[PDB]
Design an enzyme around this catalytic site. Structure first.
Site, PDB file in Angstrom:
ATOM      1  N   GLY C  28      51.763  60.847  15.868  1.00 33.70           N
ATOM      2  CA  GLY C  28      50.914  60.164  16.850  1.00 33.70           C
ATOM      3  C   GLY C  28      50.114  61.124  17.738  1.00 33.70           C
ATOM      4  O   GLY C  28      50.349  62.315  17.909  1.00 33.70           O
ATOM      5  N   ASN C  29      49.041  60.527  18.289  1.00 32.95           N
ATOM      6  CA  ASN C  29      48.203  61.234  19.240  1.00 32.95           C
ATOM      7  C   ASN C  29      47.902  60.186  20.323  1.00 32.95           C
ATOM      8  O   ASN C  29      47.753  59.014  19.997  1.00 32.95           O
ATOM      9  CB  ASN C  29      46.985  61.882  18.678  1.00 32.95           C
ATOM     10  CG  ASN C  29      46.661  61.722  17.227  1.00 32.95           C
ATOM     11  OD1 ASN C  29      45.810  60.891  16.919  1.00 32.95           O
ATOM     12  ND2 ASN C  29      47.277  62.509  16.364  1.00 32.95           N
ATOM     13  N   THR C  43      47.720  69.756  19.601  1.00 37.03           N
ATOM     14  CA  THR C  43      48.177  69.819  18.233  1.00 37.03           C
ATOM     15  C   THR C  43      49.243  70.912  18.087  1.00 37.03           C
ATOM     16  O   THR C  43      49.078  71.999  18.631  1.00 37.03           O
ATOM     17  CB  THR C  43      47.131  70.169  17.166  1.00 37.03           C
ATOM     18  OG1 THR C  43      47.811  70.164  15.899  1.00 37.03           O
ATOM     19  CG2 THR C  43      46.523  71.543  17.406  1.00 37.03           C
ATOM     20  N   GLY C  44      50.202  70.598  17.234  1.00 41.74           N
ATOM     21  CA  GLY C  44      51.294  71.544  16.997  1.00 41.74           C
ATOM     22  C   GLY C  44      52.520  71.012  17.748  1.00 41.74           C
ATOM     23  O   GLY C  44      53.245  70.150  17.199  1.00 41.74           O
ATOM     24  N   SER C  71      44.649  67.685  19.632  1.00 44.32           N
ATOM     25  CA  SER C  71      45.049  67.140  18.363  1.00 44.32           C
ATOM     26  C   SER C  71      43.939  67.344  17.347  1.00 44.32           C
ATOM     27  O   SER C  71      42.748  67.177  17.633  1.00 44.32           O
ATOM     28  CB  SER C  71      45.227  65.618  18.495  1.00 44.32           C
ATOM     29  OG  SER C  71      45.174  65.079  17.190  1.00 44.32           O
ATOM     30  N   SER C  72      44.319  67.436  16.085  1.00 41.82           N
ATOM     31  CA  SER C  72      43.396  67.596  14.970  1.00 41.82           C
ATOM     32  C   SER C  72      42.665  66.288  14.784  1.00 41.82           C
ATOM     33  O   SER C  72      41.583  66.258  14.180  1.00 41.82           O
ATOM     34  CB  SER C  72      44.200  67.946  13.698  1.00 41.82           C
ATOM     35  OG  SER C  72      45.159  66.903  13.492  1.00 41.82           O
ATOM     36  N   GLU C  73      43.292  65.218  15.318  1.00 43.42           N
ATOM     37  CA  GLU C  73      42.688  63.882  15.248  1.00 43.42           C
ATOM     38  C   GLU C  73      41.884  63.453  16.455  1.00 43.42           C
ATOM     39  O   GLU C  73      41.553  62.261  16.653  1.00 43.42           O
ATOM     40  CB  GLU C  73      43.806  62.886  14.903  1.00 43.42           C
ATOM     41  CG  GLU C  73      44.606  63.200  13.662  1.00 43.42           C
ATOM     42  CD  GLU C  73      45.331  62.061  12.959  1.00 43.42           C
ATOM     43  OE1 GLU C  73      46.488  61.746  13.350  1.00 43.42           O
ATOM     44  OE2 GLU C  73      44.826  61.419  12.014  1.00 43.42           O
ATOM     45  N   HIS C  94      51.131  56.736  12.737  1.00 49.82           N
ATOM     46  CA  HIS C  94      51.256  56.453  11.308  1.00 49.82           C
ATOM     47  C   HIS C  94      52.425  55.469  11.161  1.00 49.82           C
ATOM     48  O   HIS C  94      53.148  55.529  10.190  1.00 49.82           O
ATOM     49  CB  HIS C  94      51.355  57.698  10.418  1.00 49.82           C
ATOM     50  CG  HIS C  94      50.236  58.701  10.549  1.00 49.82           C
ATOM     51  ND1 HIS C  94      50.210  59.839   9.763  1.00 49.82           N
ATOM     52  CD2 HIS C  94      49.140  58.785  11.317  1.00 49.82           C
ATOM     53  CE1 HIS C  94      49.107  60.523  10.111  1.00 49.82           C
ATOM     54  NE2 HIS C  94      48.406  59.882  11.051  1.00 49.82           N
ATOM     55  N   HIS C 155      46.210  55.703   5.899  1.00 50.95           N
ATOM     56  CA  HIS C 155      46.378  56.567   7.045  1.00 50.95           C
ATOM     57  C   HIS C 155      47.197  55.943   8.151  1.00 50.95           C
ATOM     58  O   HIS C 155      48.275  56.516   8.421  1.00 50.95           O
ATOM     59  CB  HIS C 155      44.960  56.894   7.546  1.00 50.95           C
ATOM     60  CG  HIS C 155      44.872  57.915   8.614  1.00 50.95           C
ATOM     61  ND1 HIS C 155      43.857  58.840   8.729  1.00 50.95           N
ATOM     62  CD2 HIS C 155      45.721  58.169   9.628  1.00 50.95           C
ATOM     63  CE1 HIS C 155      44.086  59.602   9.784  1.00 50.95           C
ATOM     64  NE2 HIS C 155      45.234  59.239  10.356  1.00 50.95           N
TER      65      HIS C 155
END
Ligand SMILES: [Zn+2]
Ligand SMILES: [Zn+2]
Ligand SMILES: [Zn+2]
Ligand SMILES: [Zn+2]
Lengths: 206, 206, 206, 206
Positions: C28-29, C43-44, C71-73, C94, C155
């Protein structure tokens, strides 16, 4: 090996059984071999209000302590102590995947090598008979002759072992086997199984 | 990077693995690379009674410390350390959705873009072979050649990584992929998948 | 309404989201509107090691604080803030039933009257596009035009609201709707739905 | 039997109901009989912020305390108190397996002998009608005439009993029956059931 060490573990098993999702709808019953009979959980009292002094001794003659009501399901804990002489603790519950499988009235076949823990190439389902009746007892007694766990049609599971620790562990194991069989049964029937030979080596090994 | 910091994380991984619902029916085994062999969880002892001094070192020759029984499943943790030189921690378990998928004896295809975490466009299933045998090891060793996680027919999962933290994270990720595939498999077969191209970019990106 | 009260709730939402089974496979983000951009999870870092000082501010131009990786998202949290001006917090995950439904690439229709919480007679599925790309953003932006939650093919989910409390509540609600649809889809297809009229009154009422 | 002992148990039931996975998507409503009306949970406030002084008394005339909003679903808790004079506590929720079964618009038949707890050989499903309306009330009132629990089409469950302790226990029991029926329905339809005779003896016995 005092009465109360035995009644505490029975309680610990209830709470722990509930922890795992085995006892839902507060229906399990736990018992251990004692003197000439057993100790069992009482009927009524929810598991969270159980103290050591709630646990009821039932002698080998079927008479229970004065002023205490044993589980309504006690008769078949007695059947398992006389059917399996090596059995020293007994666990019963209406765990959901087990029961779904018992509603289909099927035995769980060797879909995974841990089926061996209950003694053979399956977990049988004994036929339906009203709870608390002697005929219910006859089914369970013949079911447990060669197996340590058995499903009960339209009802639930029974698992027996040398102490509560392993009785619980088996009960739980069978719940996992149950779920696995239902989950794959919804995709394909029959479910791939391991040959009888193959189960033979796992049992040798085990 | 002392022996006991390594044996504590192994324990922390067991407990944490159990926390997530990965280790049900107390069957997982955890290990890390060490000296010329590895440290692994012992056989028997339930996870809640494990102290650092239970963890057994197995050297590269297959001999284990004196007076300690390694997991019965240790041989294939050794296979993964020799098959994947970059692997430094190994996690194994009978997680239920993974195992259901391994009973169907299918590989999990690219149903979701996180399949890339294990290195490619799938999570393979290696064929059945009795637990603890060298032939079980040969299957796992060839399975892990190009993948970091693999299912095991009628048995369960193995996931390997640079430390326990990521080994665990992958194991868990694969359990989610497993559930997703079963849940959609019950509606439609085959399940829609993402092209090989598409997985290629996700791997570039990842 | 200080920076850190905002970064704490974001953290509280992560932990709480994980509590509910929404964030499995630590994916999650979470983000909230701030100044001319937003605050988002980094992220990470796994969620249990997140302190207020990990949370990264991203300005409206797309530039993120110095020495911090968002986040990458993040790109699609920005799309939702510009697509829905009333949106002030954004949640992504997700969650498994949502994702299974997004793998089938179906919209969830009005199977239960709470579908109204997301604004209409369904929860749409936007088509697949690689994560973190501008084309992924275009799909999400047009999906959220008339809905507050949307699935994402192969996704997961995105849910937006006036604060994190309700953003979370919707995310979660949609997970329940998701499960309900899969569980009934395995029995019968199509699944009985409530007329458009009927959803109209629930929306008036709501 | 003071107002606040009654409002505390209502709260304890919410929290406990949520504990069991019965109240997901914070939708349950709990109530108990009181004076000439009842006490019920308020609308809005999430369950974790509920203090005894949030609980709203609604008199028998339909008027609620000043400056307090009862649940939006209160009208049908009133229907059950007038339909079942022996009912003293009422529990409602959108528990997932119950609701899936209510989306299929089927009654749950005697698949397991605990169906008897709700009074007969089934758990009925009353037809759909918009929430909070008098017509919703008419359905529930005729549903609960001979049963203590009822499903509600495209909506959820209602369970009534002599106190909250048993009201909860039934609600929960019905959730288990619900899951069992869905899980077996995905394998075979119809699901094996126990004859009416057989349910008759269990009811005598019970
Ligand atoms: Zn029973
Ligand atoms: Zn194994
Ligand atoms: Zn994502
Ligand atoms: Zn409702």
């Amino acid at each position: 090996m005092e009465r109360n060490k035995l009644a505490r573990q029975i309680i610990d098993t209830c709470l722990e059984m509930t922890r795992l999702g085995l006892n839902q709808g507060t229906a399990g019953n736990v018992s251990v071999r004692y003197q000439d009979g057993m100790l069992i959980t009482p009927t009524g009292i929810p598991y969270e209000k159980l103290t050591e002094s709630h646990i009821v001794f039932i002698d080998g003659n079927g008479k229970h302590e004065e002023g205490k009501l044993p589980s309504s399901e006690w008769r078949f804990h007695m059947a398992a102590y006389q059917s399996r002489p090596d059995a020293n603790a007994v666990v019963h519950n209406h765990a959901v995947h087990c029961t779904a499988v018992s509603i289909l009235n099927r035995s769980i076949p060797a879909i995974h090598y841990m089926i061996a823990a209950a003694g053979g190439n399956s977990i049988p389902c004994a036929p339906y008979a009203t709870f608390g009746t002697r005929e219910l007892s006859e089914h369970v007694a013949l079911a447990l002759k060669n197996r340590k766990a058995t499903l009960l049609q339209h009802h639930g599971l029974i698992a027996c072992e040398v102490n509560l620790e392993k009785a619980l562990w088996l009960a739980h194991e069978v719940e996992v086997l149950a779920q696995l069989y239902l989950t794959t049964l919804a995709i394909t029937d029959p479910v791939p199984v391991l040959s009888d030979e193959e189960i033979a080596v796992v049992l040798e090994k085990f």
